[PDB]
Design a protein around this nucleic acid. Structure first.
Ligand SMILES: [Zn+2]
Ligand SMILES: [Zn+2]
Lengths: 55, 56
RNA sequence: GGCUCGUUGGUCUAGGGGUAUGAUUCUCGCUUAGGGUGCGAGAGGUCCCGGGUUCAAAUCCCGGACGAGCC
């Protein structure tokens, strides 16, 4: 015995997989210097306002 | 119905920066009898001292 | 090595039917000889992936290593 007990979720229902990335790389195309929010692969339109974020 | 996922604790980190300190030795200069907050080398403690030097 | 499916993004956290919270960090200021350290701001999610079930079940039930197919 070690006078201590408890548990952990063992990530059985809490783990995933994602390709090689960093906080200076894009999750959509894997390039460096930007993020998916600015990815050059995207059509960058059309867009506009919505009540859910403007009212 | 019941569920369980372990029997003992786990860790995902630790520390060593505390360097086995004693609350009688300054972390700023290593001298004994005071703390950094009262170091005689600080510009605003324990009594606002100032260093000196020469060139002649 | 190429082609096809790319937007998984703090990290951690128990989760027995419904948006998060807490632990900690990172960035800036104060020192820059501080690890007895702190405080405010900036950075945190419709919280494993797919199929089945009544309005709804992260452990509702089932499969499941670090992906798969073709050249
Ligand atoms: Zn991109
Ligand atoms: Zn000192």
């Amino acid at each position: 015995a070690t006078v201590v007990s408890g548990q952990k979720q063992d990530r059985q229902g809490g783990e995933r997989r994602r390709s090689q990335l960093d906080r200076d790389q894009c999750a959509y195309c894997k390039e460096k210097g930007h993020w998916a929010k600015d990815c050059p692969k995207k059509p960058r339109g059309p867009r506009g306002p919505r009540p859910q974020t403007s009212l």
